Amino acid sequence: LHRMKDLCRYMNNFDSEAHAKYKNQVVYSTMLVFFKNAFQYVNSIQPSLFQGPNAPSQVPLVLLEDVSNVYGDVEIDRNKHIHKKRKLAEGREKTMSSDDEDCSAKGRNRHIVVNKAELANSTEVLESFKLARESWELLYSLEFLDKEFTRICLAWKTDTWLWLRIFLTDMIIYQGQYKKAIASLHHLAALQGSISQPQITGQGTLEHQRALIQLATCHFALGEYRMTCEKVLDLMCDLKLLPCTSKAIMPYCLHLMLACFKLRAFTDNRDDMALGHVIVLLQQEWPRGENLFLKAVNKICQQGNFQYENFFNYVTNIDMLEEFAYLRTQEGGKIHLELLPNQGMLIKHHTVTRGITKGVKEDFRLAMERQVSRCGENLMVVLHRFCINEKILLLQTLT
Amino acid sequence: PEIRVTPLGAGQDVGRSCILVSIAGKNVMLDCGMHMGFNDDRRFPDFSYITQNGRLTDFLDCVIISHFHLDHCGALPYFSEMVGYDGPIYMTHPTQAICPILLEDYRKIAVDKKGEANFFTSQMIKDCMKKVVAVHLHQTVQVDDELE
Amino acid sequence: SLWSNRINTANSRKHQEFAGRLNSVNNRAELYQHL
Amino acid sequence: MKLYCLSGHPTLPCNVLKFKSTTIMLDCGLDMTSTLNFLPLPLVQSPRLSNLPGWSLKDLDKELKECSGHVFVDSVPEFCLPETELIDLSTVDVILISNYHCMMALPYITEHTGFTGTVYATEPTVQIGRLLMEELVNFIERVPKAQSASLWKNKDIQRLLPSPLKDAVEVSTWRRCYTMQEVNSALSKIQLVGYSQKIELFGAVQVTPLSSGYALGSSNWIIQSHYEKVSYVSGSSLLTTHPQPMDQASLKNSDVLVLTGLTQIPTANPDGMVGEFCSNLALTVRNGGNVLVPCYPSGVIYDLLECLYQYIDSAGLSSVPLYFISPVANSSLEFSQIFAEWLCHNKQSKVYLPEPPFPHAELIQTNKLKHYPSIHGDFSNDFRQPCVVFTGHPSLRFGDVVHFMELWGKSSLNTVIFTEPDFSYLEALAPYQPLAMKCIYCPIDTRLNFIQVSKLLKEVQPLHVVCPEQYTQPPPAQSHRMDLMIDCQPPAMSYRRAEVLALPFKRRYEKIEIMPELADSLVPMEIKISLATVSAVLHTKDNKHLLQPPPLLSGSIPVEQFVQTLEKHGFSDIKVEDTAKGHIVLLQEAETLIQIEEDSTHIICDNDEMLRVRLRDLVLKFLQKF
Amino acid sequence: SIPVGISLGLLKREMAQGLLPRLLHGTLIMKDSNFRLVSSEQALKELAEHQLRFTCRVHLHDTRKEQETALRVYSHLKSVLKDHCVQHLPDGSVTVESVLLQAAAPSEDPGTKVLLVSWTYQDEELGSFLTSLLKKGLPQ
Amino acid sequence: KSHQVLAQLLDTLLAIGTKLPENQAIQMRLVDVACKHLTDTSHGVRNKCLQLLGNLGSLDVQKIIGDYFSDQDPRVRTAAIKAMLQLHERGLKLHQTIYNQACKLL
Amino acid sequence: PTVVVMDVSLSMTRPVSIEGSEEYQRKHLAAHGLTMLFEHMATNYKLEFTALVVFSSLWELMVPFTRDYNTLQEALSNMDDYDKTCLESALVGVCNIVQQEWGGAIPCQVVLVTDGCLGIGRGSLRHSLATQNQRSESNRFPLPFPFPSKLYIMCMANLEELQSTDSLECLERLIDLNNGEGQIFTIDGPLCLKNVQSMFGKLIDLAYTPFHAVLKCGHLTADVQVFPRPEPFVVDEEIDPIPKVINTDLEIVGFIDI
Ligand SMILES: [Zn+2]
């Protein structure tokens, strides 16, 4: 993992004859590191393609954006959350779509905060997973190793090849280029379904869903919140915590959107839509979502107004409804509450007020009863409905 | 952790079958027969072995009768009513049906053909039958919390 | 000593002894002593 | 954890549970209501049924017959079996029979399906079931009829037929009556079990039949694996019936309570209906008419016979005869008499003094009840016209009841009284509709109603309840009675025919026995509670596990205690390195090292082997395995 | 005999590797006046945790190439040892339970060759033999 | 993975083998795969594997079946004895060593 | 008369806490309270007049009095809502109203599902019940309502979960600081299904209890016997640390005059 720091410390473009031994050793070390990283990526992210016809053909996993790092205090950036998220994800290194190659220096710019039980190893496994990008970049620095990697990618049909596709997906995931991950997700459906080998077949493939989730994370890192939400909805129907099953992929899609909304709200931006999304996402994880809820409350107070199609009238998220009700008063900054379209009455002003004697009160009671009846229902359907009916707010928040 | 068995009747003889078993602190009587041929004071088993001048119900939690023969159930009414055992007595349905008539016949014999100064009566036979709990074939009854 | 604690627990919760067994000699007791 | 339900009939269930290592069949059941779609089998070829007009369609005609609008099948009656092809019955290890009513269809399972397991049932259930299959085979084979009808079973043809024939389901799975050789073979594979008898199935699970109080030998079953218990509540009764009452206590602490055999016609009080039946037959007899009582030879006939014995003496109707015609009549009466120890305390007390339990022995002694094996024997010589006859199958499709319906059906004076609720009395009566006979429906079902089962559920408190889906909805006739439902604090999941239920009762902590020899070597500790460590060899025999005599550690080792306590326990020249959130201790002898993480410790040895074991043992002073 | 409850997972794992020379190791918790035998993980889950391991770095006596120190030493398991599971990986390492040997560069400390030998108390035989024969048992 | 489906597939394999008794290589493949799944924890799987070994088998197989006379599950023991009996009925000459193993089972 | 102190916040109609108060939503807790306390409600709280009326800022007596004996759970079960949100008049205002228009001695059952949520920052209003120590500026005001009242415990947020942002003290120190009536009824940690009726379960068997005591002078020949037992009563502590007993030194002396 750290051995690439010594091999890459020599002259990259050294003499072919004068430093023949050094160049050969560097090339061999780079090739071995690239092979080890490819094998590790294939094992961790491609469990179905790495299994033969008689093998178990388990559900493959995927690597997601370091949203926990942004939420965590290790990478708590006071003014590097909105525009620097892509920079924090990729390091501005993997500009090009490198198939079967990782050109990124994020391993040294930051680290992975993994405990003894969160990951397999707090020293070996985490360093090996994080240093894959650094080792691959060091290999690409050497001309011979880079040429060998390019030749392997070209000859091996990297889209079709399991190890090279896994490496490309991991590189795109860290780079934030959602297009490459989306293309991989599209190819992972037909490739797995039309092959006689044992894997996940059809549209409901675990590898395809995991790749779609990775594409959503990359889109969220790139700042395209609408594209990330669309990818997350499609999937639903350095290190991160995520299971290898396809069922767990759906409940992890909203994490990237929640991180982006929290980063936007905590920044100078006063986008009320991001605050509403973060409030809706407050029930996803706790007490990690408490910071997101606080940022949402601060953004709502700063903006002073909100615009949405259906937040408390039809959406039945318990946490979102409670947050909206709490923020309707002066606790949320004494701002107007808009649950229905051009409705909500006055709750920011003094409590002693008449307004509508029994019309607005009856409408609010009916909306609350409808939300309570649908409270048992999952928030995924409500989120998808708001993502389609109220896409204007999401688009405004995204830019 | 010991099983202590004390046959105070029919140990090396036939007749007056009455065996005490202490297995896990549960003291059970395995029969309550009587001896035939003995005239007095040896017809019935020695119940002074179980701390006489006291309540037998505390010591014994279960009394079992194999069948209705007098050398296996003859001393049952005397034992129960006279010495004061009010606990359960287990015996099969035909044993329950045919036991009291044998006792009645022997009671008739004792009151007519012999003396009856120290014998039981029909009302005292019927009193004993009240405590009886009928048990069917292969019926794993739970006489106690752990004893079955 | 797992066979010690459970055996002690079982023996602790027990019931009164027979008078004859307390008065027995060589695990045998005379019956019908009054005669 | 699984439950394959092979029959949609509520009162005739057939459920298999793939629970633990054994798949146990609960009841067999035979949906006899399929016979109502067929033309009845008469003892003598009647002119009315033979000359019935065939049904017309655009195509056949001789297979189907029409009588007063209803369309029937001119073929031998067939019986709707439980779904046998859903699960390979060769894998079924044990069959548990609750009632003699649920005992039917057993020859099919035992013979035709390659079943090689065991059958467990109570002796009165076995004997009465034997009588029922005896009389069923006798009725079916008495005057055999061909099975020419097969076109109407077609999927595209059954749709156009009228309602009773169109709504029949699993028609292709219907089979003719089993032969008597199959009956004798099936009953040979049976083991007789008494109430509360613990039967061990391959050392895995224990099953006991518990008295249900519904019939003679009727039993509820509880299957348990020493931690998870499954209770099977078949037809049961909490009334003052002859059998000993329900053993409700043993059903407590049940993870799953599969519940079948609930009463049909829940609105009916059986005592009132018995009184109504007696009053109706007394009224008919007083006017000189006859009475026909289709019934099983050994079911509710005894209770209504007792009530009739009580009623006639006050009613002044001792003169009229009480005929009971069935091939198994004398066998039924004798079996009812001899099973005296299978009765309640009130009626089993009749064994002490010499007296038969049932009173119909007195009916026979005073020549009030007269049982015969058929119509052609001494019955035709001793027949007196103003009489009452118990005979035939209640389905009104075979037995002597067909002959008596065809005989007395032309007069309004005679009456037919239905007491068994398992057959739709309008549908069983369909092949005879233009009769002038007075038809009375007063079913007598002593089984549990929904109030009784609600009280039993609140008494028992099972974690999950399984019942037919018919009980999770009000009956279609009412469709508005919320009281005729199974109301439980859990949702009380249900099933339909050929449905597989994945029960959530999967639990860990299977039991195991440790012998004293290994327990001597096992020593406990103290933690924060007792705990010990066991290293042994596992011996398994007949699904009973025995522990024969042949990573994690826990404790309190904070950085301060680590630095202080073991500082000078035998070594020397020790330095402490100021590491964050801990301390690093290494010795200068060979750079041997000890590093501690949060709630963790580990020992490093560098070119040293002899001192490493003692280094580990020093830390093991206060390290348990919790 | 002592009535005891053994967890289903541990019971299944008993013959998962012990069907064909075998042993069963577990921890018995006499908690809440009942006996409940479980594995170590469920013992942790019950309720004072402080893990103790061995991850020793024995200063290797073998002074040869990097390849000899790393890629040749680690194949010392299959010599005579038994009751050890076998799992194949293309990359190159021996991962049998809590065993890892491919640590790092052959000599990072300014001394002789250093390699990390790791083992636990249940698999103490392999780690002990490796450390013993690596302390001085592999001379040049 | 599941045990019921595995047992049913073994039943299917038995049906296919009985449908092609004249085919030899198919039966060797069938007995090989029966031996492979003969160590499953489910008694049903072992029962079907022993049934395959009984209906299909070269005429080694007696030793393989004989090993399961000591199986903990009694119905697996019955399946093994029935497999040996069916092998004998097919024409195989059993070894005298089976006598002592069967004597213990009485 | 006595008025139950219901929260006039908009969040009262919806569930409580930031993400979850305890077990399922408020409807399940209300149903559990109705089922467990039905026997006690039908026998001990037949004359407690409480009305589940709507309020804008604080509990007020507007609707006519009614004999609500088994409708206490209905107050928190599908209750109506109003277009008002007053966090400062939820507990302080209701307590003041109870103290003034209902007095410190009146049968009041303050049992309802309320959010009890503070602000998302430096806006914690702990003076509603903890005015003795926190918010000493209002120490001379009528707060913290030092009078007998019904226990109101808000165990919504977990102390361990809220300790991450150092806000655990504000959420946890609510029930215990509410006048310290007898003992601190505050549970910190995870929530379970049985916790819904835990607050209402404190007086399940505390309605009546049998006892044995006879009042007489000396020996007498027509001494009166008291079959039913009265409520607990003790004059000292050393003489009555356990249930009362009778001695063997009965004597009659002293003049009786009014
Ligand atoms: Zn004898």
PDB file of C-alpha atoms in Angstrom, chain A residues 181-321:
ATOM      1  CA  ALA A 181     -20.722   4.926 -14.451  1.00  0.00           C
ATOM      2  CA  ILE A 182     -24.114   5.206 -16.192  1.00  0.00           C
ATOM      3  CA  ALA A 183     -22.657   3.589 -19.326  1.00  0.00           C
ATOM      4  CA  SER A 184     -21.175   0.820 -17.169  1.00  0.00           C
ATOM      5  CA  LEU A 185     -24.562   0.333 -15.480  1.00  0.00           C
ATOM      6  CA  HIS A 186     -26.283   0.038 -18.863  1.00  0.00           C
ATOM      7  CA  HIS A 187     -23.698  -2.488 -20.078  1.00  0.00           C
ATOM      8  CA  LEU A 188     -23.845  -4.467 -16.797  1.00  0.00           C
ATOM      9  CA  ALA A 189     -27.483  -5.370 -17.482  1.00  0.00           C
ATOM     10  CA  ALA A 190     -27.229  -6.848 -20.980  1.00  0.00           C
ATOM     11  CA  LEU A 191     -23.743  -8.316 -20.382  1.00  0.00           C
ATOM     12  CA  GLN A 192     -24.901 -10.185 -17.262  1.00  0.00           C
ATOM     13  CA  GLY A 193     -28.308 -11.156 -18.661  1.00  0.00           C
ATOM     14  CA  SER A 194     -27.163 -12.498 -22.036  1.00  0.00           C
ATOM     15  CA  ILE A 195     -24.187 -14.481 -20.678  1.00  0.00           C
ATOM     16  CA  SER A 196     -24.549 -18.196 -19.941  1.00  0.00           C
ATOM     17  CA  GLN A 197     -22.372 -17.734 -16.841  1.00  0.00           C
ATOM     18  CA  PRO A 198     -24.036 -17.503 -13.402  1.00  0.00           C
ATOM     19  CA  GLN A 199     -24.746 -13.889 -12.424  1.00  0.00           C
ATOM     20  CA  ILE A 200     -27.640 -11.478 -11.858  1.00  0.00           C
ATOM     21  CA  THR A 201     -29.815 -11.589 -14.981  1.00  0.00           C
ATOM     22  CA  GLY A 202     -32.374  -9.122 -16.290  1.00  0.00           C
ATOM     23  CA  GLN A 203     -33.128  -5.533 -15.373  1.00  0.00           C
ATOM     24  CA  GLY A 204     -33.167  -6.441 -11.677  1.00  0.00           C
ATOM     25  CA  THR A 205     -29.422  -7.074 -11.503  1.00  0.00           C
ATOM     26  CA  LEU A 206     -27.464  -6.348  -8.331  1.00  0.00           C
ATOM     27  CA  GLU A 207     -24.381  -5.178 -10.246  1.00  0.00           C
ATOM     28  CA  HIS A 208     -26.476  -2.877 -12.454  1.00  0.00           C
ATOM     29  CA  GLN A 209     -28.249  -1.384  -9.420  1.00  0.00           C
ATOM     30  CA  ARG A 210     -24.930  -0.892  -7.604  1.00  0.00           C
ATOM     31  CA  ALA A 211     -23.452   0.795 -10.688  1.00  0.00           C
ATOM     32  CA  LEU A 212     -26.541   3.029 -10.915  1.00  0.00           C
ATOM     33  CA  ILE A 213     -26.097   4.005  -7.252  1.00  0.00           C
ATOM     34  CA  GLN A 214     -22.429   4.782  -7.957  1.00  0.00           C
ATOM     35  CA  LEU A 215     -23.507   6.922 -10.928  1.00  0.00           C
ATOM     36  CA  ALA A 216     -25.970   8.781  -8.690  1.00  0.00           C
ATOM     37  CA  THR A 217     -23.178   9.404  -6.169  1.00  0.00           C
ATOM     38  CA  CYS A 218     -20.870  10.655  -8.941  1.00  0.00           C
ATOM     39  CA  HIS A 219     -23.597  12.975 -10.263  1.00  0.00           C
ATOM     40  CA  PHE A 220     -24.187  14.317  -6.741  1.00  0.00           C
ATOM     41  CA  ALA A 221     -20.443  14.921  -6.361  1.00  0.00           C
ATOM     42  CA  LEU A 222     -20.424  16.685  -9.747  1.00  0.00           C
ATOM     43  CA  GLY A 223     -23.191  19.012  -8.507  1.00  0.00           C
ATOM     44  CA  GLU A 224     -25.917  17.740 -10.866  1.00  0.00           C
ATOM     45  CA  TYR A 225     -28.502  17.180  -8.137  1.00  0.00           C
ATOM     46  CA  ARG A 226     -31.336  16.588 -10.632  1.00  0.00           C
ATOM     47  CA  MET A 227     -29.336  13.946 -12.525  1.00  0.00           C
ATOM     48  CA  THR A 228     -28.328  12.290  -9.244  1.00  0.00           C
ATOM     49  CA  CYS A 229     -31.961  12.213  -8.084  1.00  0.00           C
ATOM     50  CA  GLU A 230     -33.071  10.720 -11.417  1.00  0.00           C
ATOM     51  CA  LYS A 231     -30.349   8.055 -11.197  1.00  0.00           C
ATOM     52  CA  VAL A 232     -31.332   7.303  -7.586  1.00  0.00           C
ATOM     53  CA  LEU A 233     -34.996   6.937  -8.578  1.00  0.00           C
ATOM     54  CA  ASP A 234     -34.042   4.629 -11.462  1.00  0.00           C
ATOM     55  CA  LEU A 235     -31.868   2.513  -9.141  1.00  0.00           C
ATOM     56  CA  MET A 236     -34.641   2.293  -6.522  1.00  0.00           C
ATOM     57  CA  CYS A 237     -37.135   0.783  -8.980  1.00  0.00           C
ATOM     58  CA  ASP A 238     -12.036   6.864   0.145  1.00  0.00           C
ATOM     59  CA  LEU A 239     -14.252   4.399   2.017  1.00  0.00           C
ATOM     60  CA  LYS A 240     -17.967   4.146   2.746  1.00  0.00           C
ATOM     61  CA  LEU A 241     -20.403   1.834   4.525  1.00  0.00           C
ATOM     62  CA  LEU A 242     -22.733  -0.029   2.153  1.00  0.00           C
ATOM     63  CA  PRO A 243     -23.925  -3.648   1.879  1.00  0.00           C
ATOM     64  CA  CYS A 244     -23.396  -5.777  -1.213  1.00  0.00           C
ATOM     65  CA  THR A 245     -27.083  -6.661  -1.581  1.00  0.00           C
ATOM     66  CA  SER A 246     -29.352  -4.909  -4.074  1.00  0.00           C
ATOM     67  CA  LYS A 247     -31.962  -4.184  -1.377  1.00  0.00           C
ATOM     68  CA  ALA A 248     -29.540  -2.004   0.605  1.00  0.00           C
ATOM     69  CA  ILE A 249     -28.619  -0.031  -2.531  1.00  0.00           C
ATOM     70  CA  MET A 250     -32.042   1.653  -2.656  1.00  0.00           C
ATOM     71  CA  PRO A 251     -31.933   3.041   0.932  1.00  0.00           C
ATOM     72  CA  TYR A 252     -28.389   4.400   0.404  1.00  0.00           C
ATOM     73  CA  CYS A 253     -29.191   6.436  -2.727  1.00  0.00           C
ATOM     74  CA  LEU A 254     -30.553   9.420  -0.769  1.00  0.00           C
ATOM     75  CA  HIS A 255     -27.333   9.719   1.288  1.00  0.00           C
ATOM     76  CA  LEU A 256     -25.472  11.602  -1.464  1.00  0.00           C
ATOM     77  CA  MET A 257     -28.427  13.959  -1.994  1.00  0.00           C
ATOM     78  CA  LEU A 258     -28.632  14.568   1.766  1.00  0.00           C
ATOM     79  CA  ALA A 259     -24.899  15.320   1.907  1.00  0.00           C
ATOM     80  CA  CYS A 260     -25.175  17.758  -1.010  1.00  0.00           C
ATOM     81  CA  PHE A 261     -28.188  19.488   0.568  1.00  0.00           C
ATOM     82  CA  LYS A 262     -26.412  19.751   3.936  1.00  0.00           C
ATOM     83  CA  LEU A 263     -23.287  21.152   2.258  1.00  0.00           C
ATOM     84  CA  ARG A 264     -25.374  23.722   0.367  1.00  0.00           C
ATOM     85  CA  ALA A 265     -27.344  24.761   3.468  1.00  0.00           C
ATOM     86  CA  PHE A 266     -24.240  25.038   5.673  1.00  0.00           C
ATOM     87  CA  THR A 267     -22.588  27.215   2.998  1.00  0.00           C
ATOM     88  CA  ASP A 268     -23.536  30.796   2.100  1.00  0.00           C
ATOM     89  CA  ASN A 269     -26.375  29.519  -0.117  1.00  0.00           C
ATOM     90  CA  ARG A 270     -29.870  29.956   1.340  1.00  0.00           C
ATOM     91  CA  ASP A 271     -31.636  27.465  -0.958  1.00  0.00           C
ATOM     92  CA  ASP A 272     -34.823  26.524   0.911  1.00  0.00           C
ATOM     93  CA  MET A 273     -35.294  23.483  -1.355  1.00  0.00           C
ATOM     94  CA  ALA A 274     -32.011  22.009  -0.107  1.00  0.00           C
ATOM     95  CA  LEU A 275     -33.183  22.653   3.459  1.00  0.00           C
ATOM     96  CA  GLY A 276     -36.456  20.837   2.770  1.00  0.00           C
ATOM     97  CA  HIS A 277     -34.612  17.895   1.213  1.00  0.00           C
ATOM     98  CA  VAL A 278     -32.241  17.711   4.202  1.00  0.00           C
ATOM     99  CA  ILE A 279     -35.232  17.817   6.574  1.00  0.00           C
ATOM    100  CA  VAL A 280     -36.813  14.951   4.611  1.00  0.00           C
ATOM    101  CA  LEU A 281     -33.486  13.081   4.865  1.00  0.00           C
ATOM    102  CA  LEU A 282     -33.171  13.697   8.635  1.00  0.00           C
ATOM    103  CA  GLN A 283     -34.753  10.287   9.327  1.00  0.00           C
ATOM    104  CA  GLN A 284     -32.265   8.411   7.111  1.00  0.00           C
ATOM    105  CA  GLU A 285     -29.466   8.389   9.707  1.00  0.00           C
ATOM    106  CA  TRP A 286     -29.206   9.651  13.285  1.00  0.00           C
ATOM    107  CA  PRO A 287     -27.489  11.420  15.082  1.00  0.00           C
ATOM    108  CA  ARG A 288     -25.574  12.115  11.862  1.00  0.00           C
ATOM    109  CA  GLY A 289     -28.649  13.790  10.359  1.00  0.00           C
ATOM    110  CA  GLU A 290     -28.940  16.203  13.293  1.00  0.00           C
ATOM    111  CA  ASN A 291     -26.237  18.403  11.741  1.00  0.00           C
ATOM    112  CA  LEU A 292     -28.102  18.294   8.417  1.00  0.00           C
ATOM    113  CA  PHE A 293     -31.338  19.279  10.184  1.00  0.00           C
ATOM    114  CA  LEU A 294     -29.574  22.178  11.935  1.00  0.00           C
ATOM    115  CA  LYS A 295     -28.117  23.352   8.610  1.00  0.00           C
ATOM    116  CA  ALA A 296     -31.581  23.074   7.043  1.00  0.00           C
ATOM    117  CA  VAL A 297     -33.105  25.154   9.855  1.00  0.00           C
ATOM    118  CA  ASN A 298     -30.376  27.787   9.438  1.00  0.00           C
ATOM    119  CA  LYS A 299     -30.935  27.912   5.661  1.00  0.00           C
ATOM    120  CA  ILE A 300     -34.712  28.207   6.132  1.00  0.00           C
ATOM    121  CA  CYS A 301     -34.220  31.043   8.630  1.00  0.00           C
ATOM    122  CA  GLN A 302     -31.784  32.847   6.313  1.00  0.00           C
ATOM    123  CA  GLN A 303     -34.004  32.544   3.220  1.00  0.00           C
ATOM    124  CA  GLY A 304     -37.198  33.583   5.006  1.00  0.00           C
ATOM    125  CA  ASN A 305     -39.463  31.825   2.489  1.00  0.00           C
ATOM    126  CA  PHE A 306     -40.072  28.390   0.993  1.00  0.00           C
ATOM    127  CA  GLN A 307     -41.579  27.134  -2.263  1.00  0.00           C
ATOM    128  CA  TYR A 308     -42.763  23.565  -2.807  1.00  0.00           C
ATOM    129  CA  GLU A 309     -45.597  21.593  -4.393  1.00  0.00           C
ATOM    130  CA  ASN A 310     -46.285  18.985  -1.686  1.00  0.00           C
ATOM    131  CA  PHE A 311     -44.335  18.875   1.589  1.00  0.00           C
ATOM    132  CA  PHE A 312     -46.934  18.366   4.333  1.00  0.00           C
ATOM    133  CA  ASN A 313     -50.160  18.143   2.294  1.00  0.00           C
ATOM    134  CA  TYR A 314     -49.435  14.720   0.771  1.00  0.00           C
ATOM    135  CA  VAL A 315     -45.859  13.736   1.690  1.00  0.00           C
ATOM    136  CA  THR A 316     -46.024  11.588   4.819  1.00  0.00           C
ATOM    137  CA  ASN A 317     -42.449  11.682   6.110  1.00  0.00           C
ATOM    138  CA  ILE A 318     -42.626  11.801   9.914  1.00  0.00           C
ATOM    139  CA  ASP A 319     -39.300  13.614  10.365  1.00  0.00           C
ATOM    140  CA  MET A 320     -39.997  16.087   7.545  1.00  0.00           C
ATOM    141  CA  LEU A 321     -43.512  16.827   8.847  1.00  0.00           C
TER     142      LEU A 321
END
